Amino acid sequence: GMSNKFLGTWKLVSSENFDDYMKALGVGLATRKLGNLAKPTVIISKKGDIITIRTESTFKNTEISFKLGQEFEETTADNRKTKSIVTLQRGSLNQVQRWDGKETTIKRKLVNGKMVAECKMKGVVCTRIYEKV
Ligand SMILES: CCCCCC/C=C\CCCCCCCCCC(=O)O
């Protein structure tokens, strides 16, 4: 199952190419400016077979809960209404969002004690590094 080492509170410390990823998602400039500057936390918790991922910024939060393998509805931080699914593959949490005939992936893995999120939209890739608080 998901490693217990995912559980807890993670703080963003570095990011690369997030602006273009947000462009590719259709996010407008004003919102991209906040996404490029903010350093969110990501809180991962689990109760039974339900994993919860809560993202906190001072001006925008989000939260998803899911069971591995099972599709769920998600309203994203940029206000997309998606059908999403998270699977566990080779120790990574692999989240796919689908909306409007579009698709994006957000893979979260543990590497050297950090959480690495890799995001892909139509070949535009970004990486975000999180440390464990
Ligand atoms: C929720 C707190 C940050 C919100 C500020 C920016 C608003 C919208 C940008 C939309 C980006 C959607 C991707 C969010 C990041 C997914 C990968 C990650 O968790 O690091």
Author numbering: -1 to 131
The study reports:
Myelin protein 2 (P2) is a myelin-specific protein of the nervous system, which acts as a peripheral membrane protein within the myelin sheath. P2 belongs to the fatty acid binding protein (FABP) family, and it is likely to function in lipid transport during myelination. P2 has a role in maintaining lipid homeostasis in the developing nervous system. Mutations in the gene encoding P2 are linked to Charcot–Marie–Tooth disease.
